[PDB]
Design an enzyme around this catalytic site. Structure first.
Site, PDB file in Angstrom:
ATOM      1  N   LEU A  16       0.802  -1.245   0.000  1.00  0.00           N
ATOM      2  CA  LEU A  16       0.000   0.000   0.000  1.00  0.00           C
ATOM      3  C   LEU A  16       0.824   1.280   0.000  1.00  0.00           C
ATOM      4  CD1 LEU A  16      -2.616  -1.098   2.678  1.00  0.00           C
ATOM      5  CD2 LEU A  16      -2.661  -1.602   0.218  1.00  0.00           C
ATOM      6  N   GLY A  17       1.738   1.379   0.965  1.00  0.00           N
ATOM      7  CA  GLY A  17       2.604   2.551   1.156  1.00  0.00           C
ATOM      8  C   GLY A  17       3.528   2.327   2.346  1.00  0.00           C
ATOM      9  N   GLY A  18       3.442   3.200   3.359  1.00  0.00           N
ATOM     10  CA  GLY A  18       4.330   3.148   4.548  1.00  0.00           C
ATOM     11  C   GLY A  18       3.647   3.437   5.874  1.00  0.00           C
ATOM     12  N   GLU A  19       5.779  -0.572   4.870  1.00  0.00           N
ATOM     13  CA  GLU A  19       5.218  -1.748   4.209  1.00  0.00           C
ATOM     14  C   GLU A  19       3.995  -2.317   4.940  1.00  0.00           C
ATOM     15  OE1 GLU A  19       8.721  -3.637   1.448  1.00  0.00           O
ATOM     16  OE2 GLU A  19       9.089  -3.562   3.611  1.00  0.00           O
ATOM     17  N   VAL A  20       2.847  -1.729   4.595  1.00  0.00           N
ATOM     18  CA  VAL A  20       1.508  -2.197   4.981  1.00  0.00           C
ATOM     19  C   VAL A  20       0.958  -2.991   3.802  1.00  0.00           C
ATOM     20  CG1 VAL A  20      -0.716  -1.574   6.001  1.00  0.00           C
ATOM     21  CG2 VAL A  20       1.138   0.107   6.017  1.00  0.00           C
ATOM     22  N   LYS A  35       0.309  -4.654   8.970  1.00  0.00           N
ATOM     23  CA  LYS A  35       1.396  -3.673   9.172  1.00  0.00           C
ATOM     24  C   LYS A  35       2.649  -4.461   9.595  1.00  0.00           C
ATOM     25  CE  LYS A  35       2.445   0.528  12.096  1.00  0.00           C
ATOM     26  NZ  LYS A  35       2.009   1.386  13.240  1.00  0.00           N
ATOM     27  N   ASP A 126      -1.963  10.928  18.395  1.00  0.00           N
ATOM     28  CA  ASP A 126      -1.657  11.280  16.988  1.00  0.00           C
ATOM     29  C   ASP A 126      -2.897  11.417  16.088  1.00  0.00           C
ATOM     30  OD1 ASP A 126       0.449  12.005  15.185  1.00  0.00           O
ATOM     31  OD2 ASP A 126       0.953   9.927  14.656  1.00  0.00           O
TER      32      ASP A 126
END
Ligand SMILES: Cc1cccc(F)c1-c1cc2c(cnn2-c2ccc(N3CCN(C)CC3)cc2)cc1C#N
EC number: 2.7.11.1
Length: 280
Positions: A16-18, A19-20, A35, A126
């Site tokens: 997917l993006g940021g 390694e998920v 995740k 967050d």
């Protein structure tokens, strides 16, 4: 925390993006998010046990479900409920800014998750667009809530060196000494973000942003266009962005606010959003 190859129980599908990872349960048929985290020299998974037990006992519709973790081949795979639209940040980068109503629904759902988390004496810490996930049904899920690797390395190289720190320093270094009402502030910033595609001061240097918040005569930020939004939304921002924690209202008190208690707030608002994503 489990201790085997998660490929035994799951089938990888795509990065997917940021390694998920997009993945499916081999037995159950349910789609999951995995995740993954690399762990090279002297990481200890056993120091994440108090934070995993916080994440496991979180059982709420507006929290991403935790399903278990897998240590195998120096890697920590955290398994979770899949949200196929991604984050509100992923979406608005294509769609542009959200409508006031879409933001209003988002804020109520986030408040519902925070209310629950706060009643358990847990703090999110967050709250931003990138951590508000959206499923294909237009429902709102807060993502996991840092204490590992290069991130935990960098963070403390700032406060001191751990072995030489006093207990009072240590306490602050791990937890921050601050309260649940910090998330309420962060939501207020997130509502501006969703409204404007950036938080206040995104073109200003982060350290100077922090510095200025401590100074006398500090003014909390506001919505940039006055006439675009209702007075109710301007009030929501005023009240969430109360400077003092002593005067900033709670998540449950915020659920009484006109903006989030108004009728006609439901996932359909976000189904429009996801339609807009597909046809931008
Ligand atoms: C937020 C976050 C930060 C850092 C690490 C992480 F794993 C996650 C993270 C991401 C997550 C989930 C559950 N689902 N997803 C998820 C699925 C698909 C997509 N994509 C993006 C590209 N689109 C084109 C399609 C949709 C994005 C995100 C849980 C976490 C956690 N915790």
């Amino acid at each position: 925390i489990f201790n085997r190859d998660p490929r035994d129980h799951y089938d990888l599908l795509q990065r997917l993006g940021g390694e998920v990872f997009k993945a499916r349960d081999k037995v159950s048929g349910d789609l999951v998010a995995l995740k993954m985290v690399k762990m090279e020299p002297d990481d200890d998974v056993s120091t994440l046990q108090k934070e995993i037990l916080i994440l496991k006992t979180c059982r709420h519709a507006n929290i991403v479900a935790y399903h278990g973790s897998y240590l195998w081949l120096q890697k920590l795979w955290i398994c979770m409920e899949f949200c196929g639209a991604g984050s509100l940040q992923d979406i608005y980068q294509v769609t542009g800014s959200l409508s006031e109503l879409q933001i209003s629904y988002v804020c109520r759902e986030v408040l519902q998750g925070l209310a629950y988390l706060h009643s358990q004496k847990k703090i999110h810490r967050d709250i931003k667009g990138a951590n508000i996930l959206i499923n294909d049904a237009g429902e709102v899920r807060l993502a996991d809530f840092a204490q590992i690797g290069a991130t935990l390395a960098r963070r403390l190289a700032f406060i001191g060196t751990p072995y030489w720190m006093a207990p009072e320093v240590a306490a602050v270094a791990l937890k921050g000494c601050y309260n649940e009402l910090c998330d309420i502030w962060s939501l207020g910033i997130t509502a501006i973000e969703l409204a404007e595609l950036q938080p206040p001061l995104f073109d200003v240097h982060p350290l100077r942003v922090l510095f200025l918040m401590t100074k006398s005569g500090y003014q909390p930020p506001r919505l940039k266009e006055k006439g675009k939004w209702s007075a109710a939304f301007h009030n929501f921002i005023k009240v969430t962005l109360t400077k003092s924690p002593k005067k900033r209202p709670s998540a449950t008190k915020m659920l009484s606010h006109q903006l989030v208690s108004q009728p006609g707030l439901n996932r359909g608002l976000i189904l429009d959003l996801l339609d807009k994503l597909k046809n931008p």
